[PDB]
Design a protein around this ligand. Sequence first.
Ligand code: NAD
Ligand code: NAD
Ligand code: NAD
Ligand code: NAD
Ligand code: CL
Ligand code: CL
Ligand code: CL
Ligand code: CL
Lengths: 250, 248, 258, 258
Amino acid sequence: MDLNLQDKVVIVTGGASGIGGAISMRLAEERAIPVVFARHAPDGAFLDALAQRQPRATYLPVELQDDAQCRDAVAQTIATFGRLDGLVNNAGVNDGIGLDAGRDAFVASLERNLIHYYAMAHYCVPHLKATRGAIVNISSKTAVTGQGNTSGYCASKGAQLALTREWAVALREHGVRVNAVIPAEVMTPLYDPEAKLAEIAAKVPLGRRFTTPDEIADTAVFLLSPRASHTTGEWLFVDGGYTHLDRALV
Amino acid sequence: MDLNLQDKVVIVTGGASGIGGAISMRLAEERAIPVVFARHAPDGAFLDALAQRQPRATYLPVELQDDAQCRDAVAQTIATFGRLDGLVNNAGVNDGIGLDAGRDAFVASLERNLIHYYAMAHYCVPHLKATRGAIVNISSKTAVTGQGNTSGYCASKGAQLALTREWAVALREHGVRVNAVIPAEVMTPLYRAKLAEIAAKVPLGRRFTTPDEIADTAVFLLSPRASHTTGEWLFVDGGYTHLDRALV
Amino acid sequence: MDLNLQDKVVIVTGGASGIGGAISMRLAEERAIPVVFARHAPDGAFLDALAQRQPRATYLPVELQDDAQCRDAVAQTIATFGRLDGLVNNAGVNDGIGLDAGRDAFVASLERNLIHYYAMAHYCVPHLKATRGAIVNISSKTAVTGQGNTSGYCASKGAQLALTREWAVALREHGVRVNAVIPAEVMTPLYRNWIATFEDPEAKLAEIAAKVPLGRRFTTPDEIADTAVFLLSPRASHTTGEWLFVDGGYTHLDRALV
Amino acid sequence: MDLNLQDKVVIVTGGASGIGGAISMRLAEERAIPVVFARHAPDGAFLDALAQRQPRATYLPVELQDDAQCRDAVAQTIATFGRLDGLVNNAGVNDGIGLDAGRDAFVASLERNLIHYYAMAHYCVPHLKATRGAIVNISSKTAVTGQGNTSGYCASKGAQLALTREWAVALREHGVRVNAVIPAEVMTPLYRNWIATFEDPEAKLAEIAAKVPLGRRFTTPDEIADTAVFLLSPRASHTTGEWLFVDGGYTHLDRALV
Ligand SMILES: NC(=O)c1ccc[n+]([C@@H]2O[C@H](COP(=O)([O-])OP(=O)(O)OC[C@H]3O[C@@H](n4cnc5c(N)ncnc54)[C@H](O)[C@@H]3O)[C@@H](O)[C@H]2O)c1
Ligand SMILES: NC(=O)c1ccc[n+]([C@@H]2O[C@H](COP(=O)([O-])OP(=O)(O)OC[C@H]3O[C@@H](n4cnc5c(N)ncnc54)[C@H](O)[C@@H]3O)[C@@H](O)[C@H]2O)c1
Ligand SMILES: NC(=O)c1ccc[n+]([C@@H]2O[C@H](COP(=O)([O-])OP(=O)(O)OC[C@H]3O[C@@H](n4cnc5c(N)ncnc54)[C@H](O)[C@@H]3O)[C@@H](O)[C@H]2O)c1
Ligand SMILES: NC(=O)c1ccc[n+]([C@@H]2O[C@H](COP(=O)([O-])OP(=O)(O)OC[C@H]3O[C@@H](n4cnc5c(N)ncnc54)[C@H](O)[C@@H]3O)[C@@H](O)[C@H]2O)c1
Ligand SMILES: [Cl-]
Ligand SMILES: [Cl-]
Ligand SMILES: [Cl-]
Ligand SMILES: [Cl-]
């Protein structure tokens, strides 16, 4: 299935590891041009594999919590490529800020997760309008399931789903589609460890195993493509049945 | 139906007008004790009607964006009544902060809407655990429908639905239930041809929902008649969110 | 809270046992007039308690899978009361018809669950219009969660949620509201006996209850009834088309929690 | 994006017209082998275009309401190809059976829509297990939004969403995924052969399209098809039980927007 993403310039925040890394790599495979926005320089092995698929793929060091860096990196991206066709908002961290943490910790969690999704959309949208590009927001099942000690992250991830609907409405007349992907348990390098891994994996209905970053990536990249040309405002759960299937199943 | 809220102490933020005021008034009618947290003093006719139903009902001047006023007003409430049985997070404003507004405006919207729901829960939860009380978060249909130029408010309202699920999980073993009510179109102070256009789109009766309708579901959710309902989002919207957009 | 249900006539299908019995009893307590449609004659103690609260409450023997009996029982209710204010579609059974069972078993499950919800609404709605009455459909979390070997019941319960939206649209101009209640695990004497067919009943019950997030306990029929009766009342006068989950967090809270 | 569907055998019910036809054509483009089950012989031009992409693509005449024809058609497909990799349940018709129509009309609507999705899955699933294949159920936004005079179709389309969750649970250990696609307004020549009946056919088309948030236009069959075929493929290898709305924002975006 040709996705028609060849030479499409797509910013992927947190795009050099885990889910974001897999999204960048699939974009490169589809001959798109992923532009990684991340705090830390990607590892060599990642850059080797990416450039092999797409020699023009790039990385920009960006602290997403700095509004001016977001602005300048988008500008640099436009200066380098002349256009922007996609935005994948993906950077985030479950920082475990619960009910007892207080205002400052809560707001800091919003900064780490929610606020830069808005800032990136804010700076990218004029460019996306010009190309009738697309946005994918990566959220989390916690936005709808809760978890128990992570108000900050949960609030952020839920706000991102709401913003997906809001931006889909806001941008409809410009042909800019906005969708979300909702993962549940995804194995990354990052993420008695023999036992606790087994414990978590056991709860995923399809195959009792973690979702892979590639699985999230394939749905995310489909959503950026014109193969999803009448899909906007949607939240796609890629979670092995985690959110919606009977909690009682083994 | 006896809701068993008699002498139960419930804080209602933005509780002196619009939906909040209707919630406070219904609480008083059920012989609960509403404690109004609001920026401005309620008008006299409101306070008099409230006192008629519940002489122990109380108003505290609170700017909810001030974390210290939140903390101090809760402390006051506990000092006065010795208990807290409910929190209704209700204060908010659709401030029309869109994609072009920028970071500062977006964050100011979060402060006006989202952040004080968390601050209030933060300060109330220890006391709610003591009484196996309840929380009701008032959200907005915009959280799931979008609207077009209100990123700030939409984000906030959606985060409030998420937090309803999170806090329901967090507090399950303490017997504290957390639910949300989602209104669509409710005629309230500043809301009042442009009228008819909006009303016409509400499937049930082609009319606005009333504050009393929102209040009746919110108060039901605060009560032990909803003793196994937690984490839920109750739409009270005349069909606005879920019924065919094509209907007339 | 006054639900304003005094002398309101409400048919409750399967209304003498479990969830349905609790709804009938709650209706009587709110001074409504419940009309029980059920296959089996109710307990004497149930009838005594019902009459104690509402002397006008009635019971009619009805096999709901018989369309003519639905028709005639609604007709008799109208003859007795002259009006109908509510319908609670509640009768049903999880009959464990899997994907391997085949057409005949699947259709039989639809007859036991889905088809009489439609039949009852078909015969009741013309009367509900005159009174601006209401319908509550009792569904099941299985409609959205699945279960694994119950295609017939799952299909039925999901169709009941869809029909809740459909009828809400269809009846909007008549002021007739239609909503659904979705239970998960509700302890009833019937469930209690099914659990008794297991080797270690105590352990089976605990195993089921352990999965309910709020309190690790079954929902009670009264808990389902209180929401259902609230939804029948004008206290829910702008709620229509809705699916209310009364389930201790079963459907929507993190599967990973203990 | 390689979908890895080359030489995979996929039955598509109603697969020679509208959405079903687009699904078959996309399957053939991906070098899969679509097998069309439909009541009428397909257009010659359709058969030619299909054959150009996939010479092995087949059509079997099937009345899906006849359980034995479903059974035999699946058996013939296994006899021809020796495997089954996918099932797209797609055939259906909005027959406008309201609340007032009664039992016989309602049940007939279930037969036209719901019951053959079950029958087809019943006969296909034993084979899908061996290949760790997949099912896509095509539903309708009406399952969740209602419409107003179509209880039979609404109930059917909603049962199909519920069965998607149920079969996803049932088949999880066999690695068979089950998902649904929910369209809203899709232009098919047949929809056009219904719109044709109106006094001002283009003004009617316009009234409908004006309600679709994204572009104020109908979704195309290819747009539905591309999501459906993605769901059949291992690119969606951890997606199961899901309902994917492909509807230009119809179901979920603010009704107030123009
Ligand atoms: N991994 C899971 O199980 C899981 C589950 C649900 C949702 N998600 C979502 O997936 C998305 C990706 O997570 P992942 O697990 O791949 O994460 P990851 O931590 O493995 O990678 C995230 C990347 O983003 C970068 N990053 C984070 N914050 C940043 C900032 N402020 N500025 C610049 N760079 C920043 C990190 O350095 C890292 O490179 C997140 O939005 C997460 O919430 C993940
Ligand atoms: N009116 C509607 O149609 C509608 C629709 C959807 C959701 N809602 C929700 O209902 C809730 C109540 O809104 P409303 O329509 O009744 O507005 P209402 O303004 O007329 O009253 C809200 C009250 O909250 C107070 N308030 C607001 N911000 C405050 C702050 N920072 N500190 C202290 N007090 C503050 C206001 O002074 C006012 O008294 C809100 O959460 C809103 O999102 C309303
Ligand atoms: N108990 C639970 O855990 C649970 C969970 C989810 C949903 N539900 C739903 O609650 C509703 C009631 O269930 P319950 O658990 O109370 O069951 P129950 O069996 O205790 O009571 C059902 C009543 O309906 C009557 N009935 C059944 N079929 C009938 C027919 N064809 N004609 C006449 N009467 C008939 C039965 O005889 C019985 O009196 C059902 O719709 C069920 O699907 C129950
Ligand atoms: N067209 C829309 O706007 C729309 C909207 C929502 C959902 N859908 C869904 O999409 C699916 C396809 O609809 P479509 O619009 O492409 O339909 P269509 O009418 O254009 O084609 C349906 C095909 O299925 C065949 N078919 C129907 N019943 C059959 C039977 N009993 N036995 C054998 N073959 C049979 C028909 O002959 C026809 O060839 C249906 O499930 C429908 O509910 C369509
Ligand atoms: Cl991977
Ligand atoms: Cl009012
Ligand atoms: Cl009880
Ligand atoms: Cl097409």
